[PDB]
Point group: C5
């Protein structure tokens, strides 16, 4: 009772032209698409790209595949996929996507007696995410995903999300395993682009990414915060100890500088100032300013000692407060 | 006496449809799988992936291949593999797996007169291992491996480990050659997932990894441990030696900071604090606190010298004990 | 009403030799080309290459494809592309270009009843950009793109930009997403090369790149500028403070040196001096010269103290002015 | 007189089944193998792998290819290689091997009238070398190479080195161009493995690698050796010079630490101590101990100056001798 | 008038055996080769390899392709290339070469009525260049390129440069765009190798590379040269300034050491001393020796002050001269 399926299958491929879309010159082909994100790959900030794995699925109606038999469905594999017509779907925003040919080309094809078809596939896409690091690291990146027909304009093939925009895109609970980002939600949209080769429908999906702070705090902020405190210890030393206070300010300033250099190594070479850079600059001012106060004090301690002591004692209560006050404004502004 | 085999082989492929699973619409195909891990590839903590090489094997019953002849077995190669039906097995947790086509596509196919089949294959899989580095480096990672049918639901194709769960998975003695991990054992499990395309059976194998400490001790802990001791030498110096004690504390603190920066370079950019980070912070407190004691002592040595000497002498017996006491609690807690 | 298209398509491929160009031995084939840059990939200064993605398009007239039917156009896909003749276009300046085979080979083929053809394609090209970093970072790189026939000389196949040189090349608004470069415009040109295998027409497109400064200012210039100021603080200290002033000059000089080493790490290993290098050298002279002044002052303070004070006080008003004056000339010269 | 060869060639392929080994069910196929190492690729200690290029050659007897003609040999190329049966040879120890398809698939096939065959091939193998870095850098690594049949057990196909074990493996004089290793010789062995799929013969070749020291001496040992000497200069300074001697010991100790961190960067992350690590630790003790002596001396110079001078003067003659004595034992032990 | 070409083409392929070389068993096939280097890729000193792009061309006589028609030449493309016989040329010195399949496989095939053939091709070769860095950076590397037949010995196929050895190899003016090397010229040679599979002719081409100094001067020499001068400033300071002179020598020595470590990072891990290493060692001696002089002076200033001043004053005129004298000998020796 297996040879019956072979006879049914052969009839479908008899005279089936895979170079022609269904309903050619009779109507507009309608494609219903759903996606399941197996795992959201790492996001490369330097390259402005994010890898992703998805079980991309498509559905369309083809009368040429109509058949009648005891079985209402015909599970198949990639062997018959190339023997029929499939949409020339491509990712406009993608850069380099490679398929999975292990163990067998990962493609499932299902056909119903009514002629409805389902051609799912597994993909790995190194899409590009243009990020505006103006509020880095307190930023909410919106990395989009776009795909559509490469040869069939909007007047022939139309892509529409299936079962609404709610269950069209699904993300696995463990799939979202980013180290420096925290996925919040997904949105799906549609648009038309009027290129030189006619209008083309575009299916757009956006993933809302909220960067999870804590790595930079342990890596950049705390060394800078503790670096500033180290300089302020100099104000608790005798003025005549020129050598002692010199080491604090001099060593602290250089240590402040190298942190800025090291911090941007991981960060992309953006041609503007981020929020972290402003914080570093402010920390640089405190340590640098403390050195100026010591230099100024030593320049007048031999002429007006009375004012020299007042400034040094006052600095012990001014600089810590300003740095503390600045942090509250900085953190509150960017955490609200 | 070789042409007889050719005639037998030709009959099997005569009318054999490779697009249809055996026992279609008559029963549920049963697949028995066994694995042999030739070598457990390196584990990339940064990318949360682990390479592995396996001689993946599969077995199933197909009556269409029944034959009678003098030989009870028909060893073959990849040439005939594509001429018949094979399961569309795929690794759900895999990211990028490439086959070995050297010297010849590494595939062995064996057939018995009863119709039983054996289709073994050699694979290299860059699977993903989600790790929770909360107790790093004292962690017991459990990197799983998952695979199953891509097109045939649980109602048609079922995967089961052969000869129980003991000898189903085998690891070579020299295959486990990890540098920073020590494999302890393996476990195999089965589960069903109810996706939008029906239920699918999943074969899950977990490898218990116990990180072997000793690289971080020579790389991070000892420099930190010796860094703390260097600061404590300052307490064995005259109070008036402001410049001498300043270099110890100031240089030590910065050296402590850079170790934290360098240590996390190899570690993944995790947005939380690991056990090692807490140890570094404690070491930072000792060196930083010693500097505060020196600064405080110098602030009062001109007013109450009597108490200044007591604190300095006391510090020689307090700080070493606290650091030593902390280590025992830290090591004992994370080594138990 | 679909079988009619199949009959029309079959007639075109009946006796169509894809090894022979249209109009062989009768005229010269004319090819009209247009380009759309989906995204200008990153520019690797170290490797002198720039990635780019384009929807390269070609057009030519072929009488062998003439047909008459109800439909004036025949949208198709890659399936029929290999069945006909296409130009052997190649990128002379390219190094490694790979096509996009996801989801389906991204190729659109359109045919009109008149015989006109359109064979568009999506490409990713790692072209090479020879850059002259004499005025780095104030440079205007002109990265060209070249392509032409590999087998058909200028006497048989000619490439010409379509619809003039204005709309021939189009760049997406969001496609130009470079981090350290700011695209200004594009130019297209044509030329002939007389190789040993006859004359070949070459289509050349140049992209005008204006480097966007701001990353190096925050990375190299400012640390150098602030490094110089740190040394000048020494002039505001007592002459007898040999140890204090020694740390400033000595530490500053070494910090100046390492910045030069670190700065060139990202920069390509060019065997000549860039504008930034000259700026670093000048900054090195100021810090180094300040150390010499301190050494010279200490060498005479025991013999002629009167002149020692004058030089130290004078230096407080000379070095800052010269460094400030130099910057205006340096920035004005390279920003004009 | 060329058409005669075509007729002879056609007869051989007439009825030749490439899915069946020669002498099936009549005897055991015997394969003679010889190798020529064109170049021993770089050895990646971090990845425990070594690239290699070889003109792997195989020989076997096939009566189905017997022919009679004027020419006793039939040089051919890869075109006919796929039309006949070839062994399913694979490298058990290999990880990722890719063939050379430039300019043409590099395969030479030769056939004699007697039926003897020769199927040579060019390969690039990224084999894995498990190294025991217990005596690093004074180690003699033995990187093996293993290959055998993937589908044919020992009872059907047997691999044997040709013309003995002397000329079976040949290495080019200029092929061995390793930077940090010095090849000494090669050994070839055979063994049987009783897997779950029957016995399989294995051809094993071992390359004796003797690491050539001199890079680490200029990179690690000498900086450590000179670093120790720098500290010992402190003993030639006045005791009251607390600041001067402090810089020597303090700066030296930190410089000693960073060398250990930098040294292991190139070295694999091995979870144990190497010989170099012990040498570094000993050097650390000398510099660290010298600091303790200075601290201890300053702690008693105000109470018992007489003994303070004796220790300082004695240290000038003790520490240099112990460090010198240690080196002779260390170098002699690991160089014998 | 196009169908005539098709008929002529069909006749050539009628009975044309592509597995047999022309003139089999009648004469020795002669192949004339010419090369055009489009661009000399980067030279990786670490991997001892150099990328290169070439329009490799071959020519040979085949009587089987003789034809008579109005056109004396038959331009073609890769479509017909696989239908005929081509030499099995391979690069003996190559490691990994990949062809260019964009937009179409870059292959031009031309045939004349006389039977002469021309099969040009575009290649990218990652050849290996064994370099002897004994005089680094003043070295004249000679990177060779070798190729020949893989299956046809010298008795059947012979490779000879066309039109002499002058115009056989051509390099584009802009193709030579190396950053740290300056190409001077090219040489072409021929040789025979008597392997186990008969004699094989080898075509060898050598490219004379003259390293262009200037990157290392700005990167290594100048920091070392200026580092030495910094130490010599100490001799212009009062002897009793123990702390001041200590910082110069101590800081300078460590800075000298790190430059050696950093310099060799780019350089390959060669197990011997280069010219630059000797220069660094000499610079190390000057800075290290200056420290010894200061230590020795301070050891006797309390016993024989008269000689202490003489040595310090003398050192101001000795060390600068010796370092200056050494440079002239060093530069003159390696620049002649
Ligand atoms: F005219 C050619 F450049 C061309 N070749 C393919 N396309 C185009 C037009 N074009 N311009 C930008 N993006 C496109 C586009 C978008 C979709 Br969706 C499908 C096909 C194309
Ligand atoms: F519905 C589509 F998205 C789809 N295409 C393939 N699959 C699915 C369902 N799906 N969702 C997550 N994982 C799967 C899955 C699991 C196995 Br095992 C086999 C096939 C699929
Ligand atoms: F004579 C051979 F070396 C050769 N083989 C292909 N070409 C050449 C001539 N050549 N030299 C440099 N660049 C070329 C060139 C340019 C175009 Br456009 C198309 C083909 C070629
Ligand atoms: F039983 C399966 F796992 C299996 N599939 C292929 N092989 C095996 C047995 N096996 N286990 C480890 N190594 C092997 C081996 C060795 C040679 Br040589 C040839 C084939 C195999
Ligand atoms: F005998 C086998 F090892 C073998 N297989 C291919 N070759 C050889 C001989 N061999 N040894 C080193 N280099 C070669 C060589 C050189 C040329 Br040119 C062409 C073919 C070969
Ligand atoms: C795109 O085109 C379709 C068909 O004309 C239309 O229904 C839809 O509204 C268009 N979408 C937009 C955003 O204009
Ligand atoms: C999976 O499905 C099979 C068949 O229904 C069943 O026997 C098995 O118990 C199921 N497994 C689980 C974990 O539910
Ligand atoms: C290239 O050749 C064509 C045809 O001869 C000619 O029309 C054109 O002017 C030439 N271009 C140049 C730059 O010489
Ligand atoms: C391997 O098997 C063969 C055939 O039985 C035998 O001759 C040979 O001695 C065996 N080798 C070893 C090492 O046992
Ligand atoms: C190589 O062999 C050919 C043919 O025998 C001969 O003419 C030529 O001189 C040989 N070359 C060398 C270098 O011996």
């Amino acid at each position: 009772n297996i040879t019956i399926f072979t006879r049914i299958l052969d009839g479908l491929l008899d005279g089936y032209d895979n170079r022609l879309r269904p309903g050619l010159g009779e109507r507009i082909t309608q494609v219903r698409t759903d996606m399941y994100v197996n795992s959201f790959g790492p996001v490369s900030d330097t390259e402005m790209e994010y890898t992703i794995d998805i079980f991309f699925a498509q559905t369309w109606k083809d009368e040429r595949l109509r058949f009648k038999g005891p079985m209402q469905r015909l599970p198949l594999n990639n062997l018959l996929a190339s023997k029929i017509w499939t949409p020339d779907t491509f990712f406009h925003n993608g850069k380099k996507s490679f398929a999975h040919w292990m163990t067998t080309p990962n493609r499932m094809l299902r056909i119903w007696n009514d002629g409805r078809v389902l051609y799912t596939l597994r993909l790995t896409i190194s899409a590009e995410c243009p990020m505006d690091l103006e509020d880095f690291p307190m930023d909410e990146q919106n990395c989009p995903l776009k795909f559509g027909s490469y040869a069939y304009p909007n007047s022939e093939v139309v892509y529409v999300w299936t079962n609404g925009s709610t269950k069209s895109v699904v993300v696995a609970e463990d799939g979202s395993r980013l180290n420096q980002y925290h996925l919040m939600g997904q949105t799906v949209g549609t648009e038309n682009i009027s290129t030189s080769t006619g209008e083309y429908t575009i299916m757009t999906a956006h993933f809302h990414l909220k960067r999870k702070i804590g790595y930079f705090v342990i890596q950049t902020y705390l060394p800078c915060i503790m670096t500033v405190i180290l300089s302020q210890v100099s104000f608790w030393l005798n003025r005549e100890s020129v050598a002692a206070r010199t080491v604090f300010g001099v060593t602290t300033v250089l240590t402040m500088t190298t942190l800025s250099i090291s911090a941007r190594n991981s960060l992309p070479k953006v041609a503007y100032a981020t929020a972290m850079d402003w914080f570093i600059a402010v920390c640089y001012a405190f340590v640098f300013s403390a050195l100026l106060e010591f230099a100024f004090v030593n320049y007048i301690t031999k002429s007006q000692p009375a004012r020299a002591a007042k400034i040094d004692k006052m600095s012990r209560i001014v600089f810590p407060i300003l740095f503390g006050t600045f942090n509250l404004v900085y953190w509150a502004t960017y955490l609200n």
